[PDB]
Homo-oligomer: A and B are copies of this chain.
Amino acid sequence: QSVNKYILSIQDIYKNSPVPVCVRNQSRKIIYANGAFIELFSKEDQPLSGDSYNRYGVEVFLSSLELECQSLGHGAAFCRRFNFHGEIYQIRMENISFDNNEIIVLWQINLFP
């Protein structure tokens, strides 16, 4: 609702963007993601290449960060780093809460500078 309007705005900004972005609901479900995000996490696991070449460790780390973000309350945000397929990334997460205490979290990812 007001969540849908928020999503439409994120989409307007990020739909054609090189910056991988997504928005997830309280059930860890993606409710918005752009092409860049889809492509980033579409890399097939290469389990033998190294410990960062599968999604599972990073998934738990990122889900854990997201839970922390949800817990910090409306407007809470932070930036952290993680490794994925041999590259270092940063991720910013932000808590957006709505009048019905519905919580969504914005993810924005970049390659580490």
Interface residues of A (CB under 8 A from B): 5-6, 9-10, 12-13, 17-19, 68, 72, 74-79, 90, 92, 94, 108, 110, 112-113
Contacts and interface: CB of A to CB of B under 8 A. Distances in A.
Q: Please list the 7 inter-chain residue pairs (A to B) with the smallest Cβ-Cβ separation, ordered nearest first.
A: A18-B75, A79-B79, A78-B113, A77-B110, A79-B90, A9-B12, A9-B13
* Chain A, interface SS category: mixed
A111 to B, nearest CB: 8
A74 B19 CA distance: 9
Given A6-B13, A13-B6, A13-B10, A18 B90 contact: no
A92 B90 CA distance: 10
Nearest to A65: B113
A78 B110 contact: yes
Contacts of A94: 19, 108, 110
Nearest to A77: B110
B6 A108 contact: no
Contact of A75 (B17, B90, B112): B17
Contacts of A75: 17-19
